[PDB]
Design a protein around this ligand. Structure first.
Ligand code: MN
Ligand code: MN
Ligand code: MN
Ligand code: MN
Ligand code: NI
Ligand code: NI
Lengths: 445, 445
């Protein structure tokens, strides 16, 4: 509907960035490697193929190993495109799609035959890719140069119109999955079956999604990296946290919702806690504006969580006292969000400039993944949370801060695990676009 | 029900094998590494963890990186068991299950802290694992010694009672998936949705199964490594080939079935072709007996396929002439089957002895994966096929053999793609156990 024209503009922007990167490093071009198949130890099975982000940054070929871009920022980029013809393969038609006019395409039938399409004098080129020993054999002395990658990673923060469209489509697929997952939860289904419901609606399976989904019932919602999926449902399914996304052309969505089951003891109470976290998400989204330091968004999240901890009677101190004593970190221990793009935890969040000068997170907020200034064309997650994490509550109970905690109230919330409400937002010059809310993903459907 | 006693016997057999391997190499012990997490290039996501087969050969811990066995074939094996306690992890109870009494278990909280549990003098030990640079840093000069691995791989052919039980359970899960997949096909569902139906019934997802499933409709059934799953069903779904398995404690099932849709033009004809391939599978299974050369099973398969090609009028030559002219290879181009176990294409199929002397497949049958003599306690796949592979038919049409082919008959079968019927069989001294058929997986359900 608009992708060919927007893609051609995307290519012009990438060519411009490539010219600058090449000037900084003193090179004539880059050779960008999609990757290779990875064989299991002692075995003939392979790992799922995961394309080099620097390759899919140019072209929506995400499922094809042994492909190579040769770019100089001036000429039409060369795409060496892997297309074996052995009888056991599904041989697709030669590439022909919205993107193909942008490239000089060379078909490669044998991965080991790639030298014939590469530059003769590689002294002037840098290989960009994971297979640094392969690049060495092929003759590249310059591999993954920091000046090039720091510059490209910095610019990756600013999405082109094409990229923003791809991210909108990824959000659409993810939202469909999310709505189906909520229904499956309310049907009493296991974590495993809820995940299949999400796959069925998003049309994305476990090796299509851009990160492994968190599908967590009851107390599992307190476990931030909960990776199991139980195949039997709990006797009582009272709460549900799902963190799951989708890919479109290699661009990610990254969405979290939390739910309370109708009819269980204290359902309304937990539901209202979810609603309070939701209001923090939306308030923080409104605080995103060009010029704001993203660290201030993180600190503002801690202020919101403190207000909830106070209002619910969980902590018998004033909101600023709850913050200043460090108590909010027990309940909200991770970062407020991060750049989103070709990678889920997208690149450039902890640098100050395009040369890679570090700007690390504060010491008391070590898991914050972005400290950049907010600007137009950036895409962010905003993901406040409030959890009842047994290990951190136990640590807290053994401190002097334990006397301010109403442990009866903690015990009432604890069986519901925790809460996170994560949206994906495009920052524009004069407004924000909450892709997730624009698709009518709120709190119950 | 019987697993603790059978497992203890399994451990005694492994200790015996370990004593022999150690004697051949001149070592005092092995250090066997489960593996490590693999990070995506430039990213913080990880590949799905895949356990070292030599580790899961001892213990049913298949989802845990940074674990280490120390074995000498005499003492109770040491298991260094990874159990980090950081707040973001689901911390399970300390290991306690049927297998745990067999080990001296040392808990490891930090992967990089493993040196404290390893032998001081490593000169006498061999590391067995993928992370050979890690082993070098830790001080092992002996890594993956051929004498040890050739011996252990040879003995892996002969399954213990415990292993046979695990393989029976894997077959049970796979069969459940297979029956559900057939139903989904007959409902007109897409490849993608058929795969979800299989997951739902087997309770195994894309990263649980021991190989990526082939889920192929119509002409896709002719594509032996068909890896796509279309998300929209064809206008007419006339045929279905599914090659899919399951894991139980790291042991694989590996099953293929093919189906014809009721009511389509030429349905009965294709159905009858499936039935003829099925009769070849069953006849070949009866030919498996201790003392038989597995290569003779492969050649016997070619005789059966020739008989079908003759009987159907596809090829206007006598059955032995069809074989001797090489025509059967166009229709059945892969091997008749392979050892099955901890790995799908299980180890030791192409060696003559326990020192690794090669016994490669014949030149005219290069994809045959097993040339071993059949013996009791071995587990095999038997997987004859008959396909209509456009690339090979085109090659054939350009040869003098083209004049013997009834291309009208080929054109009638071609839209159905192809056929494979694969069972998993345990060879006993006096009989075979067809695990797959024992679970009532035949041709329509
Ligand atoms: Mn996120
Ligand atoms: Mn997330
Ligand atoms: Mn097989
Ligand atoms: Mn198979
Ligand atoms: Ni368009
Ligand atoms: Ni048992």
């Amino acid at each position: 509907s608009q992708h060919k024209a927007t893609y051609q503009q995307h290519i012009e922007e990438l060519q411009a960035r490539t010219r600058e990167a090449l000037q900084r490093e003193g090179l004539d071009g880059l050779v960008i490697h999609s990757g290779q198949g990875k064989r299991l130890f002692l075995d003939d099975n392979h790992y799922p193929f995961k394309v080099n982000p620097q390759f899919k940054a140019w072209v929506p070929v995400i499922d094809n190993p042994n492909c190579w871009l040769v770019v100089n920022g001036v000429d039409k980029p060369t795409l060496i495109f892997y297309r074996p013809e052995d009888f056991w393969h599904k041989v697709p038609p030669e590439p022909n799609d919205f993107w193909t006019d942008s490239f000089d395409i060379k078909l490669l039938q044998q991965a080991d035959a790639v030298e014939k399409f590469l530059p003769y004098d590689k002294s002037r080129f840098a290989y960009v890719g994971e297979y640094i020993e392969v690049a060495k054999a092929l003759g590249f002395d310059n591999v993954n140069p920091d000046r090039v990658l720091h510059y490209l990673h910095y610019q990756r923060a600013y999405k082109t119109d094409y990229e923003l469209d791809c991210m909108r489509e990824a959000n659409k697929l993810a939202v469909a999955g999310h709505k189906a997952a909520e229904q499956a939860f309310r049907e009493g289904k296991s974590e495993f079956d809820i995940n299949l419901a999400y796959a069925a609606a998003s049309r994305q399976g476990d090796n299509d999604v851009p990160y492994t989904s968190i599908v967590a019932l009851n107390e599992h919602a307190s476990i931030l990296h909960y990776m199991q999926c139980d195949t039997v449902a709990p006797k009582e399914s009272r709460s549900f946290l799902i963190d799951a996304g989708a890919n479109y052309h290699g661009y990610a969505a990254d969405i979290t919702r939390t739910y309370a089951q109708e009819g269980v003891h204290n359902s309304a109470m937990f539901r209202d806690l979810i609603q309070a976290v939701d209001k923090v998400t939306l308030t923080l989204v409104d605080s995103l504006k060009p010029g704001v330091a993203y660290t201030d968004i993180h600190l503002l999240a801690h202020d919101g969580i403190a207000q909830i901890l106070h209002d619910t009677g969980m902590v018998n101190l004033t909101p600023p006292e709850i913050v200043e004593m460090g108590i909010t970190r027990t309940f909200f221990p991770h970062g407020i969000g991060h750049f989103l793009g070709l990678q889920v935890h997208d690149v450039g969040g902890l640098v100050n400039d395009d040369r890679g000068t570090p700007k690390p997170a504060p010491d008391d907020h070590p898991f914050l993944r972005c400290t950049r200034m907010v600007e137009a064309r950036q895409v962010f997650t905003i993901e406040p949370g409030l959890y009842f994490i047994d290990s951190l509550l136990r640590d807290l109970k053994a401190t002097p801060a334990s006397k301010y905690i109403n442990w009866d109230t903690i015990d009432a919330y604890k069986p519901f695990g925790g809460i996170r409400i994560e949206d994906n937002i495009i920052v524009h010059r004069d407004k924000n676009e909450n892709m997730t809310r624009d698709l009518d993903l709120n709190l119950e459907h």
